[PDB]
Design a protein around this ligand. Structure first.
Ligand SMILES: O=P(O)(O)C1(P(=O)(O)O)Cc2cccnc2C1
Ligand SMILES: O=P(O)(O)C1(P(=O)(O)O)Cc2cccnc2C1
Ligand SMILES: [Mg+2]
Ligand SMILES: [Mg+2]
Ligand SMILES: [Mg+2]
Ligand SMILES: [Mg+2]
Ligand SMILES: [Mg+2]
Ligand SMILES: [Mg+2]
Lengths: 340, 340
């Protein structure tokens, strides 16, 4: 795919990212800059890079090839890495707050001996690197302020979404009463859809000089729906995915989360299955978690998900028919192929 | 003082800040916006406001009174609150990472039943509010990008400083060998001096149309030295200050910190006092902490600090003589009176 053939160059650009960001030497900060290097290497590397590559792929498809200079392609790869760094910031903090164990096939940063809650500041540093990179690479470009504002707004929206995620999942309480489809859709729009799907395409758009309100609004209409599916898939895989593939161990049941699975469970459960859920959800005991997973299987939730994926795929394609123009449909099609 | 007579209006502006920031209602995010309100009220209120008031005071002294519109004064009070919000973001995270107990006369946010590590996301939200406010109030102003860049750069510098703070104070280790005057001065320049002293005056400068490199450089020369003293004072008060006055309980000894006190101790200690330090520092036991405090008193560190405050005050005033022009000396004098 077009993600395949952009990958290698994009990934190789990381050493350049790290080089430029370690050159703040101010010899006095040398030890901190070395810590930053370590943090970047542990937390920005080892996933699929789909968000960052999305910026690069869309940039190649929206920019006139004659305008695809060496320099403007360096900027695209940099802006792609900015998206990956935003992801790394949110994931470092999220793993702490979700009490997670592994991520991307290694133990979570904060679980590393000698890191612990110092990881909070490491996460803030990852965030800071975004704006340092934008200044360094894009400061003289017409779209500079547009990109700054887009990244900050996307961060605010994600943080609002994380807020709702955490409010809906208070530790060691109950009501399943909070866990509604309406609540779920709002959580995921905010925590996932904006930064994972809107951000990378929007950033490429602005870089291509496409700054129009209506063009961004139509793009957003497709991309936010993609983002909802992606988070539903993430919730499904939390329980039913293979950790060798996902790279991480699920914590949604123990964490009392408004997962798509629990929302679907509740919609289907008999009064008696409800009581089993209520007695077993939101608790660390492996035995109780296993009971929840058994309920989910009794209700054929995996089959519900497979049906949903089909209906969602067809809906997203219908939206691309409606909303893609005047942008190349390929911009959306490539993305949808990556996620579905 | 001029801080006295700006205070009331500045503090009253907070309800307006909170009002404008809760009006994102998107009914769906209502619960998150209510959490944000709670976070703002707990974490942005109850200190002395000296950083935010500094923006307002310097704005009144650098801007032509004829240009001090109703609107431009609303912007100054807003930019002042932006500085206070930046402070709140850093303090929420710092209390978690320093395992602190109280702040500003109440228990730390993260220690509140039902908050815990969710406070990490609350802190990120406080950060986000800065840029939301700058957009809302300042977006059409010539200095808009200057203020965005200043706040981001100040955050990056503070985070670099926090990095060095934490690297120098590894939990449950030793060497006092790390604790040198050189290391100390670099920590505090970065973690304190930029955001506490340079930021608020710089922000007022940019708002006044003073964007010149040399003017900012000369201002920085005074303000960074003030910031070093302020952090030395903060370290002194951590142990020897009255909690009813400081609002918080000290943790520097237990936290193994490169405090000014330990650096001064080491410079003075006999080989035998060194061994007492090494045996007792960096540990939670009240008895061991008391032994450290006893060593500090044996070495007359409080008297060393009082002498230092005098020498520092005289040095800062000498710098204001050298470097203040063409800005009103009052801008620096008022600040120095507040801290000394
Ligand atoms: O931990 P992961 O499953 O990767 C998780 P969540 O914790 O939201 O499930 C972290 C995260 C953060 C923002 C948007 N989606 C996600 C997925
Ligand atoms: O906790 P406080 O004493 O308020 C502290 P530090 O933890 O650095 O001593 C927090 C903080 C953060 C940045 C600059 N100075 C300070 C003072
Ligand atoms: Mg998680
Ligand atoms: Mg999460
Ligand atoms: Mg998940
Ligand atoms: Mg502290
Ligand atoms: Mg600290
Ligand atoms: Mg302190």
């Amino acid at each position: 795919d077009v993600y395949a053939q952009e990958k290698q160059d994009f990934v190789q650009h990381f050493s350049q990212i790290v080089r430029v960001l370690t050159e703040d030497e101010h010899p006095e900060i040398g030890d901190a800059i070395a810590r930053l290097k370590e943090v970047l290497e542990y937390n920005a590397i080892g996933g699929k890079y789909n968000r960052g590559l999305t910026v690069v792929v869309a940039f190649r498809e929206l920019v006139e090839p004659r305008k695809q200079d060496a320099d403007s392609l360096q900027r695209a790869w940099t802006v792609g890495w900015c998206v990956e760094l935003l992801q790394a910031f949110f994931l470092v903090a999220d793993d702490i707050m979700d009490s997670s164990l592994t991520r991307r096939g290694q133990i979570c940063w904060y679980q590393k001996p000698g890191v612990g809650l110092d990881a909070i500041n490491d996460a803030n540093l990852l965030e800071a690197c975004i704006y340092r990179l934008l200044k360094l690479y894009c400061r003289e470009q017409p779209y500079y302020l547009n990109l700054i504002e887009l990244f900050l707004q996307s961060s605010y929206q994600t943080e609002i979404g994380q807020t709702l995620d955490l409010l809906t999942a208070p530790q060691g309480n109950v009501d399943l009463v909070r866990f509604t489809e309406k609540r779920y859709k709002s959580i995921v729009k905010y925590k996932t859809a904006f930064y994972s799907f809107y951000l990378p395409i929007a950033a490429a758009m602005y870089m291509a000089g496409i700054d129009g309100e209506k063009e961004h609004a139509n793009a957003k209409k497709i991309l936010l729906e993609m983002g909802e599916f992606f988070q539903i898939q993430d919730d499904y895989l939390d329980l039913f995915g293979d950790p060798s593939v996902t790279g991480k161990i699920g914590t949604d049941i123990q964490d009392n989360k408004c997962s798509w699975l629990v929302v679907q469970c509740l919609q289907r459960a008999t009064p008696e299955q409800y009581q089993i859920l209520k007695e077993n959800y939101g608790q660390k005991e492996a035995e109780k978690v296993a009971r929840v997973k058994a309920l989910y299987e009794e209700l054929d939730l995996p089959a519900v998900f497979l049906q949903y994926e089909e209906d969602s795929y067809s809906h997203i394609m219908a939206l691309i028919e409606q909303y893609a123009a005047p942008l190349p449909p390929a911009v959306f099609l490539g993305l949808a192929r990556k996620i579905y």
